[PDB]
Amino acid sequence: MSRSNRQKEYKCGDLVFAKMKGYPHWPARIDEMPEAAVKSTANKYQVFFFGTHETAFLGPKDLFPYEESKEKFGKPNKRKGFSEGLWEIENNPTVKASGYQSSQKKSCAE
């Protein structure tokens, strides 16, 4: 069966663009791979949207090579905050994180 011989794959730390309905490709990066077959996650991933530092789940069909689409998707937008992402993806692709839990058993400061 010859049905378009193409099988791409992304990994944590990879710089890609995520397409959303009503919005243009937003500069993003991979933060985690798919579990296996749990919850309502067919083949999505946790991508980080620079500028706003927001995260969401999208499939590979909605993800594209940043460097490759940088010139096409790397341009200011009316949604505001888009440009801010351009600077981050270039100046700091590892900006922001998942978050840490301060004080679990006891606290000292507050």
- CATH number for the domain harbouring residue 37: 2.30.30.140
Query: Phi then psi for 35, rounded to 5 degrees?
Result: -60, -80
| 16: phi then psi, degrees, rounded to nearest 5 | -140, 170
Cβ-count burial of 40 within 10 angstroms (0-12 exposed, 13-18 middle, 19+ buried)?
exposed
Cα(74)–Cα(28) distance, integer angstroms: 11
Q: How was this structure determined?
A: NMR
CB 34 within 8 A of CB 44: yes
Residue 39 marked in a binding site:
no
What is the residue whose two structure tokens read 């500028």?
Answer: 51
Note whether residue 77 is domain-resident: yes
Is 72 annotated to bind a ligand? Reply is yes
Count of domains forming the chain: 1
The answer to whether residue 87 sits within a structural domain is yes
Q: Is 107 a domain residue?
A: no
Q: Is residue 75 marked as binding?
A: yes
Q: Find the domain containing 88 and state its range.
A: 10-93
Q: Would the annotation count 80 as a binding residue?
A: yes
55 inside domain: yes
Start-to-end Cα distance in the chain: 63
